[PDB]
């Protein structure tokens, strides 16, 4: 066996057969958090057109 | 009567003893649905 | 997802496939995720 954090693929599974996945995993992006921002329309955004 | 089941079939132990599944084509979970209440505040009295 | 490799003919596969799915029937796997794969600050900032 080979236990660990071994991502299921296609090129791998053609030669060695895996088991049922038990943790979800993909590809994602990590970036640094920056200063908060509000919408530019805040002068009139919180108001309905009916007003 | 049917040699394949293309439908949402949650992978389960009791279902896996007799038939063999495939690698999931979507991951998910179980969640609770209830009714949204009080969409907006009344505020009938502007002098509340 | 992740997984456990085998030997392409292992015949150990079925006892392992039918064992992992049993934990999800209980909440044993969910319990582990709280022990290790957990942390703080899962917020707003004034500008």
């Amino acid at each position: 066996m080979a236990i660990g954090s071994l991502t299921i693929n296609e090129e791998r599974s053609e030669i060695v057969d895996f088991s049922v996945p038990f943790v979800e995993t993909g590809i994602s992006v990590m970036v640094a958090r920056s200063n908060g921002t509000v919408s530019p329309s805040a002068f009139l955004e919180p108001y309905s057109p009916a007003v | 009567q049917a040699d394949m089941i293309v439908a949402p079939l949650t992978i389960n132990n009791e279902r896996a003893q007799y038939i063999e599944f495939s690698k999931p084509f979507k991951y998910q979970g179980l969640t609770i649905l209830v009714k949204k209440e009080i969409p907006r505040s009344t505020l009938d009295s502007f002098m509340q | 997802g992740y997984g456990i490799a085998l030997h392409k003919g292992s015949r150990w596969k079925r006892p392992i496939d039918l064992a992992l799915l049993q934990f999800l029937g209980d909440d044993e796997i969910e319990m582990l995720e709280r022990l290790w794969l957990s942390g703080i600050c899962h917020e707003v900032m004034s500008s």
Side-chain angles (χ1 to χ4, degrees), chain A residues 1-37 39-51, chain B residues 1-36 38-39 42-48, chain C residues 1-42 44-47:
Chain A
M1 304 202 311
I3 200 177
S5 62
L6 202 57
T7 305
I8 291 183
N9 217 17
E10 175 183 359
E11 182 179 353
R12 305 184 192 181
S13 56
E14 280 182 349
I15 65 182
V16 15
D17 64 327
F18 297 87
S19 76
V20 163
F22 52 100
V23 182
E24 186 183 346
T25 281
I27 286 190
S28 69
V29 186
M30 154 172 288
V31 294
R33 192 201 292 262
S34 297
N35 179 258
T37 311
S39 175
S41 61
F43 56 95
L44 281 173
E45 180 166 350
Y47 295 131
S48 178
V51 177
Chain B
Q1 305 186 15
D3 312 340
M4 181 178 295
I5 303 178
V6 285
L9 269 194
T10 317
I11 283 184
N12 215 337
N13 187 17
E14 288 71 35
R15 315 217 203 190
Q17 287 180 338
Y18 301 85
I19 85 180
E20 64 165 352
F21 283 134
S22 295
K23 293 306 195 303
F25 67 89
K26 199 183 192 305
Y27 300 73
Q28 71 186 18
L30 267 60
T31 186
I32 307 179
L33 174 57
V34 303
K35 181 180 182 299
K36 189 175 186 175
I38 313 300
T42 57
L43 195 51
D44 201 335
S45 64
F46 52 93
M47 297 176 178
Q48 159 189 339
Chain C
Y2 291 156
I4 308 180
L6 281 179
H7 205 286
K8 187 55 184 181
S10 69
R11 180 260 319 176
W12 279 102
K13 168 174 168 50
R14 198 172 185 270
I16 286 178
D17 270 355
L18 303 173
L20 296 172
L21 304 185
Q22 181 181 353
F23 295 160
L24 282 175
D26 299 331
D27 286 0
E28 288 169 316
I29 284 192
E30 185 182 6
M31 185 270 298
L32 294 193
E33 286 190 352
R34 341 204 64 83
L35 206 66
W36 304 81
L37 284 165
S38 66
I40 67 184
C41 63
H42 56 280
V44 292
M45 300 79 61
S46 62
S47 178

